Design a protein around this nucleic acid. Structure first.
Ligand SMILES: [Cl-]
Ligand code: NA
Ligand code: NA
Ligand code: NA
Ligand code: NA
Lengths: 216, 459
DNA sequence: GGGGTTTTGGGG
DNA sequence: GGGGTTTTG
DNA sequence: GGGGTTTTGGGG
């Protein structure tokens, strides 16, 4: 039994081709999570790991409406309750986005969240980047391995085996190793991208804009 | 500079004192605030190294050193226990019963590290020789000066360090928790285990498969850059680890930015005993083979003992630089690790073809023995950590016509169209090799632009 | 006082 | 000091 | 000059 709500959600999402409709219903209940940081990075924890929530323009406006005396960029150490949220997969540059791995990210789309101002939360372990956890990383790798394997088995055909004569009696034979490279798929660029999941799309707000909106 | 022994240093003077000591434990230099970096380490010497032995239980006695600085680079990185350190202008005080030396490097204090063994960890990893037996392999500030009178101190302390590490445990039982009890700890704890496997999870991370004296097997993520000295078969002490309650598929240890992985000097009695006591474990592997999906990596092969000392080469170098890098060009035999994505030909029954040694041609045995000697002509389409993101898969061959890799499958070549026993084993092996988290550690020989597997068998 | 530096006598 | 940062592996 | 440090204004 997974004790990390975030780890279980995000894992099932990946284990279900990024289909948020296939993830267990008994997991789509409100999320009461402690706010670790609010700026420059808004990070919340589920008592074990921390993830970066993505607020829709609607979510912030609503918030700002029901809570005028509350600034989101100042919610650090404070707790919030995400009542309406969703999960979707997005291709990102992990070299820049630390809340991701292997150019893949599972995003927590926030639609409605209430700030339970001044609610002391129970003492927990030090929150770690879910996307740096061994198992999760392994789960993501499984995801890519499955996608890669399916791609190659559909791209590589005809048993084009190196003619045995090339490796046998290679006394007066020289070759270039790049002659062993094979395209894993029909991908356009140099980075594998033949995935089946349909990359989720949803307008989200940059944490910087919400900073200006509350203090130009 | 006058050097005083740990147990004799003054507690009252409160004046800067200097000393030479052995480091038996140390945290990784860590940032505390927007301007401070700390590094705590336990030190011992001829006057302080063991507790009143009678009811002490041979528990190691020690002093603690806390170096403060404004920059990470100004603090010492201890990869190995047993090495020596020289400090200048430190203040000694009593902190909860024990002698604590404090030195503000950011002001006027300085440190220097000396290798107790012939080479420092870094020099071992880089196969370099030490400038001399009086040259610090690491030190604070821009300069370090060793006076003639110091030579004796350093030499004697090195001699002492070995006697001490070969005679005692140095890292006594009270200095770490048994992995099979790790789940009972409230917070972080220390570990002392053997590195059974070093799996290259990705570009910047290693995943150590540790097993201690208790027999429990745990995994942990060790950054390559931070701890470049991890080597399978060696015994290490982990400073500050926590039990990961969120890992359900496998026992995991979480490390912090201040956690450290330390090895022991060649003379370490502890390390020696553990290297021999703790024996490789494959339970996790075997068990994981019954699961459609294993979140645990299983190295399916093993190279001939004569290669266990051969360094590995990433596919990236093997197929993208082997023809341009001076070093890679001089070699014809390499050791590498990868995971098989696809095996060719598809039909396992065609893995063994008939070979005509005179015409240099192979052929299907679906027509029977009329094709010559039986040989394996399998073509593996691999990939690894170094090429994980690119849109490529690389071919690694197993053509046994000349004997190379003949016993790879532990199944002597044979007409797979007739020998059901031989066909089944290979088929099964094929499912394993292409199964997620299955990796191959093999030695290959370059030939006419291709790499052939040799001295590598399945286990 | 004493570093490293240049300020080369004097701030906080 | 037996510890909690980051131009966030 | 400016830190750390305590010398708390002044050496080399
Ligand atoms: Cl060649
Ligand atoms: Na001056
Ligand atoms: Na001065
Ligand atoms: Na001064
Ligand atoms: Na002063």
């Amino acid at each position: 039994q997974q004790q990390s709500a975030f780890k279980q959600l995000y894992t099932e999402l990946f284990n279900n081709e990024g289909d948020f409709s296939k993830v267990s219903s008994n997991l789509k209940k409100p999320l009461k999570c402690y706010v670790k940081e609010s700026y420059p990075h808004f990070l919340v924890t589920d008592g074990y790991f921390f993830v970066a929530p993505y607020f829709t323009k609607e979510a912030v406006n609503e918030f700002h409406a029901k809570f005028p005396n509350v600034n989101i960029v100042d919610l650090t150490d404070k707790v919030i309750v995400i009542n309406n949220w969703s999960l979707e997969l997005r291709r990102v540059n992990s070299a820049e986005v630390f809340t991701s791995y292997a150019n893949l990210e599972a995003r927590l789309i926030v639609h409605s969240f209430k700030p339970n101002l001044q609610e002391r939360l129970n003492p927990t372990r030090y929150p770690v980047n879910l996307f740096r956890d061994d198992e999760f990383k392994t789960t993501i790798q499984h995801f890519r391995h499955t996608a890669l394997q399916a791609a190659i088995n559909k791209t590589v055909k005809g048993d084009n085996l190196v003619d045995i004569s090339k490796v046998a009696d290679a006394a007066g034979k020289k070759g270039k190793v790049d002659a062993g490279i094979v395209k894993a798929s029909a991908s356009k660029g140099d980075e594998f991208s033949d995935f089946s999941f349909k990359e989720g799309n949803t307008a989200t707000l940059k944490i910087a804009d919400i900073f200006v909106q509350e203090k130009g | 500079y006058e050097y005083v022994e740990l147990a004799k240093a003054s507690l009252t003077s409160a004046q800067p004192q200097h000393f030479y000591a052995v480091v038996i434990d140390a945290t990784f230099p860590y940032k505390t605030n927007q301007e401070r970096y700390i590094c705590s380490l336990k030190i011992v010497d001829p006057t302080l190294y063991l507790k009143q032995q009678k009811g002490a239980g041979d528990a190691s006695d020690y002093a603690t050193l806390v170096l403060y600085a404004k920059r990470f680079e100004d603090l010492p990185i201890i990869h190995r226990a047993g090495d020596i350190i020289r400090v200048h202008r430190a203040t000694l005080r009593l902190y909860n019963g024990q002698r604590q030396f404090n030195a503000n490097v950011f002001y006027s204090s300085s440190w220097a590290l000396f290798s107790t063994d012939k080479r420092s960890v870094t020099q071992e990893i880089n196969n370099q020789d030490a400038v001399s037996d009086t040259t610090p392999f690491s030190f604070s500030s821009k300069h370090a000066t060793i006076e003639k009178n110091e030579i004796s101190i350093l030499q004697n302390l090195r001699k002492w360090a070995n006697q001490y590490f070969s005679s005692y445990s140095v890292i006594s039982s009270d200095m770490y928790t048994a992995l099979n009890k790790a789940q009972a700890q409230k917070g972080d704890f220390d570990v002392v285990a053997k590195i059974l496997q070093v799996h290259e999870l990705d570009e910047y991370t290693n995943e150590l498969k540790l097993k201690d004296a208790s027999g429990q097997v745990f995994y942990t993520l060790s950054l390559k850059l931070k701890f470049p000295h991890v080597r399978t078969g060696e015994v290490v002490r982990i400073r500050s680890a926590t039990y990961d309650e969120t890992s359900t598929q496998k026992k995991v240890l979480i490390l912090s930015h201040y956690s450290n992985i330390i090895t022991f000097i060649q003379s370490s009695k502890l390390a020696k005993e553990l290297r021999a006591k703790i024996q490789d474990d494959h339970s996790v592997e075997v068990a994981s083979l019954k699961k459609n999906v294993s979140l645990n990596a299983v190295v399916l092969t093993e190279v001939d003992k004569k290669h266990a000392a051969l360094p590995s080469t990433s596919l990236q170098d093997l197929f993208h630089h082997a023809d341009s890098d001076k070093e890679l060009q001089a070699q014809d035999t390499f050791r590498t690790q990868f995971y098989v994505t696809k095996i060719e030909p598809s039909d396992v029954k065609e893995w063994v073809k008939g070979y005509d040694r005179k015409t240099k041609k192979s052929s299907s045995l679906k027509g029977a023995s009329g094709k010559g000697d039986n040989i394996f002509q399998v073509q593996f389409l691999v990939k690894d950590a170094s090429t994980q993101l690119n849109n490529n898969t690389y071919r690694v061959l197993l053509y046994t016509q000349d004997g190379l890799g003949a016993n790879f499958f532990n199944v002597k070549a044979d007409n797979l169209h007739k020998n059901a026993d031989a066909r089944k084993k290979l088929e099964d092996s094929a499912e394993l090799l292409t199964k997620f988290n299955s990796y191959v550690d093999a030695v290959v020989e370059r030939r006419n632009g291709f790499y052939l597997i040799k001295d590598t068998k399945l286990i």
